[PDB]
Design a protein around this ligand. Structure first.
Ligand SMILES: Nc1ncnc2c1ncn2[C@@H]1O[C@H](COP(=O)(O)OP(=O)(O)O)[C@@H](O)[C@H]1O
Ligand SMILES: [Mg+2]
Ligand SMILES: [Mg+2]
Ligand SMILES: [Mg+2]
Ligand SMILES: [Mg+2]
Ligand SMILES: [Mg+2]
Ligand SMILES: [Mg+2]
Ligand SMILES: [Mg+2]
Lengths: 7, 371, 251, 371, 371, 371, 7, 251, 7, 7
């Protein structure tokens, strides 16, 4: 992703 | 002598003594329990945290709101909040002086019955009274005629009052409120590329809304401005140090209030609801009601909410009507301010519900001697 | 330019469990700029990556790998390896065989340092029970190289399983390489090319092409006795492999 | 002329032609670069290995998944795997016929935008379209109503559909999926006494997951048998050559879906998410949604999953209701099969996005013309 | 020969041919428009649903009533239902044979003008006639003398007829009816603990009212009995399978017919309106009205309404009076039967208004030849 | 009754009373069997030399480490190491007072299972407890929040703890440790010219590592100074009398911790595995863990290690983050020092596994009660 | 609540 | 049965670095059943492990070792290395005696081949400065072992560094060895017991006990000239040690 | 309607 | 260990 999850 | 007042509700709760100019005890109504095994011996930490304790350590606890949409759902966790505010925060014994409570209009009858039982059994308060959160806003503004919009965390309700004599048939309740706005902001932020899943980050989303979100005067032209510019993008600091940029979501989130179709809610918008409430009243009194429309609640703290509603009402209402929106400062504590003034009034000493009245007739007395 | 054909025994993850044994193999390969490794039973290329982990630890561009497809369906899925330094020599073109249980592989390097600028290398480890076939077969394969690539000099090594009763007097003349003067044999039968005490010249270094003959250093072609050179015993020598490296020096 | 249905999910990729009943190209979505410089015999420097080639030469190559929870983190590698699936496997130029892509719902908006830009420029296909993976699942079953449970390798989501009308407010997405189960199995098997840490070793663990683990009808009841019975033990052979024994670790891994607290996720169980999905919908369509529940995704192939899910929903849902879990065979390829049916439909021809539309309106056309 | 008769009342609509003893096309007068996008393209669907189609799929559609308080509001939507009943339901072209229309008295002038124009222009019907719904009820019962009690979905009205000669100076129109009763049941059911705010749920409330609600002979006495006994309680099954409990709300809602002040209506109760209507008539005929009091309309189906009707009138009327209440079965469709009998009458055939009269004089002829 | 706290780890083993500030019995956990038949003057350990005695006679003996990567392999050899610890070194009967043991996280169950059996059968200790090595590190530092970096001889792991609630899903374990560094230093020295093969020579290389090796922040450039200057070259004399010189190998050996690819291990570096553990934590607890990082273990007193890791982390971490590396003096005994503090605590007494509890539930209680 | 909304 | 004493000059790792010298020392030690080793500079027992390894490489129980903890009072500390064949003689008991830089040790031996059954071995490498002072106390040690261990025959022999100006005629009468005829001196003084050309008889042979004096074969006490016996030169012999082994035979 | 009621 | 690692 870009904040929360590792992605 | 001085009577306690507690505007119990979803989100922040305000408690204080009678005659005080501002509530001295504000804290989120959050009850949480750990989701991990204790590993440190001698830590001394308890197994339940409320108020500021849960907010500081929200990364471990599973936060649960006892009050949802204005109806208490978990009396086990709910009672802890009341026990905490009286003892740990207010540092006063509740059984010495009367306690005043508030609730939203059009609530299940079972909610009031259990509220009375807790006061007269768990705490044994000499006197108690429950008042509508809508009628308390008039006393704060020093008016007797008008409609209020106590857009809180759980329920948005409008009650037209004309020099007293609150009309029961014109009371409109809408489930859309501040808490549902956060869930929408949770979903719309996923499109940009930020994901929040657990309850711990739900509080983070709420802080973002309180610092950046605002209501645009017009909706259709506002989207065009963000399409060919970046001036509307503001940077924010996450608790962990990461930087997040908010795009056009700054104004889209508060827009769900006026267009419930964003959340799929079939009910009319917040501005249409007030228009519906006014039309239910008689024609002879509609002239006064249009002029006096005071707001309330934290959900109406967005900048520009005063001008946007006035445009919506003016287009809907017939022309040559003095449409005035009263949104004074401090209105975030409007419900508590009125209660403190109203409790200090000498006339309130007659309609208190004493423990003797509850004993002789049971909890059902709250529907007869109290509105 | 030191070129050797090292016939490792059972090259795989099993020999990679030991660390000391792999350390010696690292020492051996560094001696030769171009070295041929045969009979590598690796199928997922796990073991070959371990070498380049050690070989190229000093510098990523210290060696390059040239490996073949698992053409060896017989028992283990072995594959040939062409370990060469890239800045000595550079690979230009290569192709597979085009009669053998193990198809031969041919590669070409651009050796600017030596007088021989272009040359071809043929690697072939053969079947011990079928020694007669390939040795005459590759002679026809040699002729094809001189026209499809137009290279006059072509370099031959591999594990041909020669001598030690594998080939007899009747079939010694059957080898076209012996009859033809161009395919001179650098390794005499007297030299021992296996780690065991028994004399066995299994590998045969063959140099073809008139310009290549002047390029090879006279007397340099000799088996490597890494057992005595490194001060090792017979059991550790057999632990690595049952064969001795056979080098050649190019000037 | 025809339509290229491509499902670039995580773990595996399915490609084929419209109208066929089964994909013709299935391979892991793994791309590997040469760790050490060198060339192949009879070939040039490939510089990249995609799919089954990557697993064959995993020793001298790195292993990296371009897809993590349905998000394209890197685009240089995604360009390669698309190149591999068009020329080396399907053996057909994409410039002749349009293609169709699939994506997870609630994905970041930047993910879909780059999908359009790459394909309309690198491959220059005449037309393109993007569809929700969950929506395509309903077409394979041939139904028009019912919720869709798409538990893929990286993302698990539910999309309730009633009479062809989607409910965007009722979409719930869970990051717990088959990939997280594989990582959870490593820690569980560590307790038994086996250690797996290598990326190439991770694939061997996944092979154990697909053949031995099953979901039981109860935790405490069956685990009591496991602690006092060797019949549940099943021996397995690693490719290295050794033989291991799996006992009570067989059932804990596939059942983390129902109790996500084992991994630390605060999100509720997969049965809870499906139950919460329906509850967000209106009352009148709840009878239909409960009856038609379609199971999809690779992580749904565990034996006994239908019985466990039905038991969980029955307890939560009110009684006297016909609960039915539809788990037909060939459900692993349900997503691709639906894409072939949708592409072959003549009515769908008016939904393709052509080059003329893309050029004038820019890459952002996929947001309005497409879903 | 044959003549169409269609009950144009709000809510349920009736249709049929002249001479039949029972209508065949009965369906609610509701029209829905979807508020969600159609993700599934397999079928073309429709953007409008009228009649049982909207009732079958009221989960997604937004129900709207074209006829409110016996007034057509949306003429564009009003014409759509007429298409459905003529073609889709009755399979009969309006041009073949004449049609008969019904409406409530004291209707605004513009309503009659445009209703006739639609008949002449869109459906080009050769001849039609608009009749008072209450007047037709007398023909159904056979008697031509008495006072009619028509209490429809939107409007409850009275008109006295004494051997013909309908009195225009004694007609009273009251807007309180079953539609507002359901809205009142909407509010009171909140107190018990159930919410049905959305429009789709609003139809569920009407089903509950038509099944469990009943009229109590003595409102005050039944309040005490219900407050101390569960015998009056009855259960119900919602479409989703949940079970609700109805207490005093079972009979409080139907009792609002006699206490309009509960709904905020300044108008007096229907029993007093019936008494007031007779007072406006001359004393010579007042004795006749008490003998013949017929009941009509859907809201008369509440059990015990006839017994309550005669009890109230007895109080206001002097002693030694013949208080007779006539409540025949099928009175919900009594208006349709009365129209069918009137159309079959040969004398009334000369009273139709023809097309040639309309063109010569315009739509204003509806107020000279048509009554 | 005291509380025996013994580390029982790889390499050096610590044993001492509860409440003491420093261990008393410190000696390598090496046991050896006499390769040679002969015995010497008044010789008492004929079965096997145990402890530092085998160190003084490693030329004759053969050294075997009972602990490899933190798991017991030779249970018969472990029974000697405890028997030597309790009797000939600590000089007390273990049956008089109970003993506390430590174990690395993510250990096989068989290691803990047989641990209980040995203590309650061979030594008949009154009670026993097992504590994670990482957890006890925080107690010595006196803090309750932060991560733990225990880099021992056989295993390196990180266990983040937040306010006494350790997170099971964030525990990471790395197999590379101090023992592997010694092997790497032996291999590089062989190329230098000094070959070490015997177990006695392996110990000597370890002594060289503990005295000369150090960590350089500028490793990518230090080798230029090493290759262009002899200042970095230091000479350490060997027991045989030959003085060897260590040049660039002085700092290359400690670099294997940050670059595991030097040893062929594909796992991430020690600096990276700390960041990965934090990345798996909650967002709101991310800020606190960065401030509190505790370094422990014998492979941590390398000079300059704190600076290198602090610089490495601040590159990966977002800016404006206070990264503090807390490295208390005398961190070689942090694991044991924390054990003494926890043992002396009165609250910790209730967590001991008494012998009576072991009898009823067997050895299976070691996981029900402990971590 | 008890039927309609989630409460 | 054969007994001999060999003093090795600075027995430490510096000596087995050479391999030729390592080959030599195995030869002499195999020639006798009981060998006495002194001047063991080894501290970590590295040397003894390698030394007997060549002795037990084939049969694990050809020789058994007894080693003393370093008893050197000064910085230089030596060990009493013992090597005996278990089949011919077994160790019964050991004792470390309580005047000397390194205190002596005594052990019991059961020799079934010889006429005597139990005899006590006393070994001591004397201090060259205090050779006269320390040898007198050995008489008390001789008095010690005859009742506490109750052995009639005790064998005392080692490097006492007598003669060559270390012990003159006046100091010869000072010691109690020559005074009492119960213990008799064997190794001739004229004979040279050192690897050097100088005739220095540093090794002294002392025999006590009536039964053991009958067991010793007359004329069997003579230096072992390994320089001449093995045909080695002087500098090769000096590398092994500066002394010559002394051997006695008991029948 | 046009004034009084909502219609 | 018992599989992966050497222990
Ligand atoms: N069985 C019933 N019991 C009670 N009320 C009913 C029943 N059936 C219908 N109603 C009420 O009657 C109203 C309309 O009925 P009806 O008079 O037939 O329609 P219209 O108003 O067109 O004449 C509806 O709003 C409904 O609430
Ligand atoms: Mg509020
Ligand atoms: Mg071989
Ligand atoms: Mg030969
Ligand atoms: Mg998928
Ligand atoms: Mg009607
Ligand atoms: Mg340790
Ligand atoms: Mg002399």
């Amino acid at each position: 992703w870009x904040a929360x999850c590792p992605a | 002598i001085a009577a306690l007042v507690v505007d119990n509700g979803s989100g922040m709760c305000k408690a204080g003594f009678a005659g005080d100019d501002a509530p001295r005890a504000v804290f989120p109504s959050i009850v949480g329990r750990p989701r991990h095994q204790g590993v440190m011996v001698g830590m001394g930490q308890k197994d339940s945290y409320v108020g500021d304790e849960a907010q500081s350590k929200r990364g471990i606890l599973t936060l649960k709101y006892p009050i949802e949409h204005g109806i208490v759902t978990n009396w086990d966790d709910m009672e802890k909040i009341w026990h905490h505010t009286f003892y740990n925060e207010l540092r006063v014994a509740p059984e010495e002086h009367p306690v005043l409570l508030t609730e939203a209009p059009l609530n299940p009858k079972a909610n009031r019955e259990k509220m009375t039982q807790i006061m007269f059994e768990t705490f044994n308060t000499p006197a108690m009274y429950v008042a509508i959160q809508a009628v308390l806003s008039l006393y704060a503004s020093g008016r007797t005629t008008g409609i209020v919009m106590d857009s809180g965390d759980g329920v948005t309700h409008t009650v037209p009052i004309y020099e007293g004599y609150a009309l029961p048939h014109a009371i409109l309740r809408l489930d859309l409120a501040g808490r549902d706005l956060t869930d929408y902001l949770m979903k719309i932020l996923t499109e940009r590329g930020y994901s929040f899943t657990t309850t711990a980050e739900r509080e983070i989303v709420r802080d973002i809304k309180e610092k950046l979100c605002y209501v645009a005067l017009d909706f259709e032209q506002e989207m065009a401005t963000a399409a060919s510019s970046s001036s509307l993008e503001k940077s924010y600091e996450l608790p962990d140090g990461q930087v997040i940029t908010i795009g056009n979501e700054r104004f889209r989130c508060p827009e769900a209030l006026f267009q419930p179709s964003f959340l799929g809610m079939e009910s009319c918008g917040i501005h249409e609801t007030t228009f519906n409430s006014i039309m239910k009243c008689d024609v002879d009194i509609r002239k006064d009601l249009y002029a006096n429309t005071v707001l309330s609640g934290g959900t109406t703290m967005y900048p520009g909410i005063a001008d946007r509603m006035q445009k919506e009402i003016t287009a809907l209402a017939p022309s040559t009507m003095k449409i005035k929106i009263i949104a004074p400062p401090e209105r975030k504590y409007s419900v508590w301010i009125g209660g403190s003034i109203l409790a200090s009034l000498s006339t309130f000493q007659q309609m208190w519900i004493s423990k003797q009245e509850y004993d002789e007739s049971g909890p059902s007395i709250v529907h007869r001697k109290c509105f | 330019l030191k070129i050797a054909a090292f016939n490792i025994r059972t090259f795989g993850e099993t020999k990679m469990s030991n660390a000391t044994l792999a350390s010696y193999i690292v020492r051996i390969v560094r001696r030769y700029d171009i070295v041929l490794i045969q009979e590598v039973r690796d199928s997922h290329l796990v073991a070959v990556g371990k070498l380049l982990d050690y070989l190229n630890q000093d510098d990523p561009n210290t060696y390059h790998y040239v490996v073949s497809e698992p053409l060896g369906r017989n028992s283990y899925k072995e594959r040939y390896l062409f370990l060469f330094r890239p800045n000595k020599v550079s690979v230009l073109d290569t192709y597979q065989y085009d009669s053998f249980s193990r198809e031969p592989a041919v590669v070409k390097f651009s050796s600017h340092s030596t007088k021989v600028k272009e040359f071809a290398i043929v690697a072939l480890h053969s079947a011990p029970s079928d020694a007669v076939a390939e040795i005459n077969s590759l002679y026809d394969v040699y002729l094809d190289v001189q026209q499809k690539w137009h290279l006059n000099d072509v370099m031959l090594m591999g594990d041909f399983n020669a001598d030690c009763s594998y080939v007899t007097s009747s079939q010694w003349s059957s080898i076209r390489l012996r009859t033809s003067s161009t395919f001179q044999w650098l390794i005499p039968d007297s030299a021992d090319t296996t780690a065991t005490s028994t004399n066995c010249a299994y590998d045969r270094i063959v140099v073809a092409g008139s310009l290549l003959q002047s390029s090879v250093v006279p007397g340099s072609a000799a088996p490597f006795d890494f057992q005595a050179a490194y001060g090792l015993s017979n059991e550790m020598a057999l632990a690595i492999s049952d064969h001795y490296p056979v080098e050649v020096t190019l000037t």
